Amino acid sequence: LDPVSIKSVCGGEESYIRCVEYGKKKAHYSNLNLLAKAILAGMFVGLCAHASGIAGGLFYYHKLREIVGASMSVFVYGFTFPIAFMCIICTGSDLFTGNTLAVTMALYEKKVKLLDYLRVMTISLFGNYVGAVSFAFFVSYLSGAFTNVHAVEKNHFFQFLNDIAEKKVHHTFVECVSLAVGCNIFVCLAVYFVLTLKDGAGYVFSVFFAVYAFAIAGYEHIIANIYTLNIALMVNTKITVYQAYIKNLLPTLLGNYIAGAIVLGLPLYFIYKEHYYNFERSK
Amino acid sequence: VSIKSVCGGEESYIRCVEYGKKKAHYSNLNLLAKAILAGMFVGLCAHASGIAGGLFYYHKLREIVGASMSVFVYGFTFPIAFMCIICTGSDLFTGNTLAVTMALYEKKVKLLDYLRVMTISLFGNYVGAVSFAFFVSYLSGAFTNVHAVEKNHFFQFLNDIAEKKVHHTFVECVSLAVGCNIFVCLAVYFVLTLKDGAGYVFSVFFAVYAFAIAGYEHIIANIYTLNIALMVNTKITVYQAYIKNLLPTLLGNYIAGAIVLGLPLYFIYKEHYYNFER
Amino acid sequence: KSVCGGEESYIRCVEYGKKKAHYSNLNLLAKAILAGMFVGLCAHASGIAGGLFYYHKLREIVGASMSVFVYGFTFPIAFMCIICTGSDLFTGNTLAVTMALYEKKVKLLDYLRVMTISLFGNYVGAVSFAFFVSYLSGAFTNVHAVEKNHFFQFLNDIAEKKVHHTFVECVSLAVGCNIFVCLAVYFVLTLKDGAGYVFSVFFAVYAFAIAGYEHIIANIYTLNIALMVNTKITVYQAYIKNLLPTLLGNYIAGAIVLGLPLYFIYKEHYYNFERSK
Amino acid sequence: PVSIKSVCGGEESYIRCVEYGKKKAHYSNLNLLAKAILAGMFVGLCAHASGIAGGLFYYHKLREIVGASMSVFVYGFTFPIAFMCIICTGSDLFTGNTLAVTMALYEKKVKLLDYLRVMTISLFGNYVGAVSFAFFVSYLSGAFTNVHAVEKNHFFQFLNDIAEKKVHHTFVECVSLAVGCNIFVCLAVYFVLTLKDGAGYVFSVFFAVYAFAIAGYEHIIANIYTLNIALMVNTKITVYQAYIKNLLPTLLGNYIAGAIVLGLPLYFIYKEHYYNFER
Amino acid sequence: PVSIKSVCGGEESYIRCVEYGKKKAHYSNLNLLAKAILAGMFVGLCAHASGIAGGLFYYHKLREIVGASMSVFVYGFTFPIAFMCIICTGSDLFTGNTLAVTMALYEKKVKLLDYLRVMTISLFGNYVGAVSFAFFVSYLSGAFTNVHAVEKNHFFQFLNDIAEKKVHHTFVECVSLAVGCNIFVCLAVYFVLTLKDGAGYVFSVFFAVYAFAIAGYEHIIANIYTLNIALMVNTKITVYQAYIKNLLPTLLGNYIAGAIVLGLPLYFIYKEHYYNFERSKR
């Protein structure tokens, strides 16, 4: 006897087509369903961010730092954080960062009209913001986790956050923009990874490595940064709204959109636009 | 030749709805044993993980890394509980909320069966956890106070985790339980959708690991930890255990499983379960 | 799909347990011996590892955490070999052949023959890999210098602990062990894929080990070799205090706490499945 | 019950290799250039990420105990995802192409000019993408700046040390290190061509990449990224040391690894059965 | 939804093995030689990588606190990639193919002449590949050079230690350690042969070879590469202590493990089941 082979891989035309169709479907939903999907996605992001911050603050201890700095903490933070996108995608959710590439690709192919593009993007952005800030208020702020203690021994869950936030509010426009470009490149790949492996083992680990690289690299995300900076504002961490909404979030937003539609959408449309035709004529 | 293993959203929603539905033809007596066995599994993994963490809680290591490696290895070790629970047909409260409540919302179950399934499973988990705490953890002398400071790294850890679980306030434990049960319901959704074997392990692993290393409270693990921390004469009072820790984390886990994930999910997908029947 | 769980698992298990009696006697003995020396192999490995990390100056900071961690990380490879080769190990089969007995698929004499022969073969394999490999290698010998002796102190520091545990302690720890191992066999026969096999057995065994639970077969190896290298123990302590309670506890767990309930849980399904055809 | 064999042997990996290489030259001169640029982009991005990791693990005090141990390990843990992105995106890397297309040629499926067409388009696009990402992201971010203080300057100092060590080798050393690198790389390509699984695709490449990373091997495209960005951030190196001392030897070695060490023996083993295959 | 299971363990994993060990003997002399040489190249490559890792971790100040733990740990984490190379590219390795060729002989599918021929070709190719990589790559690359400076020499000293531990053994010690090594690697071959799924191959062989390496057992090919590179970079050993004190015992023990300790019970257990395979084949 001899077993039978299974094709657990299919790339190229297949993946691009899957992504364009994904972007196409997002049209014939309704406003409420997209709203809810986006809010759930924001909730998941915020939850995994809470978890990763607590890990980091554990490893960001009074004395470890005098030797090791912020390495172990950022590492475990990155290690803990990617579970979120698995939740998001396998729940049926909508992420603004993940929708840039797919839906602008469906736009380029002249399937999703413009008003649809705009309302989908706006609703997803709004819902993600809602989810993240909500989870920042109810679950985190009321849990007394990241609150100041005035004890060098015990306050290592505060400094960490503070530090990270104090880091994201001193860069310049160009810096944040490029870092967000890198972020969205990664997460778009991560999305491409989950629309291509078509198996359980492949999804988890590809998305894991993508998001771990994103985190350990120090890049920026409009949905993660919202959570972090809002909650740091809830604790009276040494930042303000100016330093957060007016300085950082707009850079990250524009960088994500760029890396989504231009850096990675135009090339992919150009390369494959001629094989997406032979699939639409047949059917 | 070619077909895709993973299936999210619609298929997974139908799956979870039917899984909640099937908890109501089991004649009131398989549920009890299934629950007690899941509780035994919980307490077993908790014993193992507490030993793991008391190892990295040594006298001198505390000074430098201060309770980091302990929590990390505890989280790394705890997950297998869920795999053994699911691969055995057992029943767990924190994971039954989501499914049975979705089934309820769809008018495939009544309030009677819903309430009694909830109650039976809760009681079975309590029974299993306390039984394992008595038979294995207390008589094994693994968590005995050896007053010497070199060898007492197994007791202190427990004393210094439960002591934390019992000096919260209400809202705090409620929120932390909401987080925990969101993670858990999500691990269950995974295990129902992936249906592969690879993610069947690693998705649940990562989810439970985040749960543990984040600081969230789980109703069953709490029962075990606190009961066995009572057996060994820690500095926790029996009032600080049942009226400060279990009530709020229970409420929070039910909140999370029932309204946070369930309601919006049933709202996004109500339409597409109305078509499968026909 | 590549996983069913719950019902089909019980049936797979009782069938796997039922085929152990059509086997000839010697074949079963050979499988048991192979499994014993597999256990001894992986134990030698895990021990050299935990000894590497039981270093003179590393102890004074972390104590013994790194060593036991590496032990638990390395050991979870024997049972993969036992399963893939078609062997038969005692702790793993306690549950399997007791269920076949419950459903009236196996008699008493044959069930007990299976148990005796498998235990004997496991002992043979363990002691054989001990003598012919671990003791002639000169790997655990003493050197009388704290710089290199970290491979012997470890042993002197572990079998001096399995020994001093009292009766109920060893019984409960063996219970935990055999529960983990029963779940491991359940998984490895119900999760139908390589990733599933490997990563559902690995975590179970790592937890068993890191938890301080005692296994009948592993402790045989450890105590034999600890006797050969002239550690600070004795045959009395090695056989009476540690092995008999471990055996009793492993059997109690595999055969009562775990198989007696689920048997009642999933009885009608096996019954009608055998009435099917 | 069903029987499954998601793996395949060497008789068909070689054929897939041949076919992949054969296909590679049938594309336009435009989409090939774009694929190359995209692969270089991926490479530069993951190199940025891995270098920031390694520098994070390069603190003042952690150096005085473990030197440069953990940094290389985390670097090599982070580096591998580049080839996943590349292969699943449909893009081509120059090193991978060196073995894939040389074989297409030996079998006489391709001709002598499309080989060079493809090689040069790929190398040009890889250089373009690497240098572009080095500029738009790694120099516009102040990540690898010389802040001039031993607390944070580690992020730069690491690069300095790595770069300096990379450019002080003799001609015969870099060619051999490059040989090893490209061997591992073409072998990971072989893997992802034959195994046909997500677990495979991910981890078979993870291990190989971690290996040629932490072994101190030299890769042709990686080096374009880290040497060009080094020039930007004003390390203690020089363009002569960066181009005539590393890239020429590295390229020669990568090529004589992809196309001789592994290419000729394989073409001797499995050529007969390719004749069996065609008909 | 349809069920799929990949691993058909036990009985099947024997049959395949036999056929495997048989194909090696229908091949030609050029093919098998090239295959062995490629496997040797792979072994030498991965061993160089692993030594560099371990010495990077064997830093002057790290040793005074940890000894040699992290070194061997990362060595064992890095080495288990040669095996996948050899498996997927179709090479004839010695310690591995010994069990299969035995099984093919015991089952009277192969002759004694052919057995000796295949074994000699395999071992010769391994020696060639490993020495070629130890000279053309590892020795010219100055990786393991002596600098006579402790802040930097930690890639040399590591080697100078490993070898200086492999050549203060006695005969029975090395024989048993080789027995163990081969009981591990033959087992790894069994895993990939019977798993038939992606993660199976990689992670099974990874754990097996990691345990092997961390165990301290000796494998005939790796020791060739290591002792030869050490002789190149002028450690404190010589050739007598290389082939007379380590390689003969190691090959002996490995062959014993392959064809006697393991396998022979696998013939006795299953000899019939092979006979169960032809008559119903047609």
Curated annotation (Swiss-Prot), chain B:
Which keywords accompany this UniProt record? Cell membrane, Membrane, Transmembrane, Transmembrane helix, Transport, Vacuole
Q: What is the effect of changing G9E?
A: Appers in parasites grown in the presence of BH267.meta inhibitor; modestly increases resistance to MMV007839 and BH296 with no significant effects on BH267.meta sensitivity
Impact of mutating G9E?
Does not affect growth rates of yeast cells when transporter expressed in the strain lacking endogenous monocarboxylate transporters
> Mind listing the GO molecular function terms for this protein?
high-affinity secondary active nitrite transmembrane transporter activity; lactate:proton symporter activity
- Catalytic activity from the UniProt record: (S)-lactate(in) + H(+)(in) = (S)-lactate(out) + H(+)(out); formate(in) + H(+)(in) = formate(out) + H(+)(out); pyruvate(out) + H(+)(out) = pyruvate(in) + H(+)(in); acetate(out) + H(+)(out) = acetate(in) + H(+)(in)
Complex and partners: Homopentamer.
Instruction: Kindly provide the name given to this protein in its UniProt entry.
Output: Formate-nitrite transporter
The source organism is: Plasmodium falciparum (isolate 3D7)
Give the taxonomic lineage as stored in the record. Answer: Eukaryota, Sar, Alveolata, Apicomplexa, Aconoidasida
From Swiss-Prot, chain E:
What does the record say about activity regulation? Inhibited by diethylpyrocarbonate (DEPC). Protonophores, such as 2,4-dinitrophenol and carbonylcyanide-3-chlorophenylhydrazone, abolish transport. Inhibited by phloretin, furosemide, alpha-cyano-4-hydroxy-cinnamate and alpha-fluorocinnamate. Inhibited by the Malaria Box compound MMV007839 and its derivatives BH296 and BH267.meta. Inhibited by the Malaria Box compound MMV000972. Inhibited by broad-specificity anion transport inhibitor NPPB.
Q: Please give the chief subcellular localization of this protein.
A: membrane
As for subcellular location, the record says: Cell membrane; Vacuole membrane
Q: Which residues cross the membrane?
A: 30-57, 69-89, 112-139, 171-195, 199-215, 239-269
Asked if Transmembrane is a keyword of the record, the answer is yes
Q: Coiled-coil annotation: which residues?
A: none
Topology feature Cytoplasmic, residues: 25-29, 90-111, 196-198
Q: Which GO terms describe its molecular function?
A: high-affinity secondary active nitrite transmembrane transporter activity; lactate:proton symporter activity
Entry keyword annotation includes Iron: no
What keywords does the record list, in alphabetical order? Cell membrane, Membrane, Transmembrane, Transmembrane helix, Transport, Vacuole
The reaction(s) this protein catalyses: (S)-lactate(in) + H(+)(in) = (S)-lactate(out) + H(+)(out); formate(in) + H(+)(in) = formate(out) + H(+)(out); pyruvate(out) + H(+)(out) = pyruvate(in) + H(+)(in); acetate(out) + H(+)(out) = acetate(in) + H(+)(in)
The observed outcome of changing V185L is: Appers in parasites grown in the presence of BH267.meta inhibitor; increases resistance to BH296 and moderately to MMV007839 and BH267.meta
Extracellular topology: which positions?
Answer: 58-68, 140-152, 169-170, 216-238
Tell me what the record says results from G96S: Appers in parasites grown in the presence of BH267.meta or MMV007839 inhibitors; increases resistance to MMV007839, BH296, BH267.meta and MMV000972
Look up what happens after changing F79A. Moderately decreases lactate transport
Q: Which InterPro entries match?
A: Aquaporin-like, For/NO2_transpt, For/NO2_transpt_CS
Summarize how pH affects activity: Optimum pH is 3.9.
Query: Which domain of life does the protein's organism represent?
Result: Eukaryota
Name the GO terms of the biological process aspect. lactate transmembrane transport; nitrite transport
Listed GO cellular component terms? Answer: plasma membrane; vacuolar membrane
Record membrane topology: Multi-pass membrane protein
* A Pfam family this chain is assigned to: Form_Nir_trans
The record's function comment reads:
Monocarboxylate-proton symporter that mediates the efflux of the waste product lactate in the intraerythrocytic parasites; active in acidic-to-neutral pH range. Transports L-lactate. Transports D-lactate, pyruvate, acetate and formate. Essential for asexual growth but dispensable for the development of gametocytes.
Q: How does the annotation summarize its subunit structure?
A: Homopentamer.
Instruction: Report the sequence similarity comment from the record.
Output: Belongs to the FNT transporter (TC 1.A.16) family.
Q: What is this protein called?
A: Formate-nitrite transporter
Source species of the chain: Plasmodium falciparum (isolate 3D7)
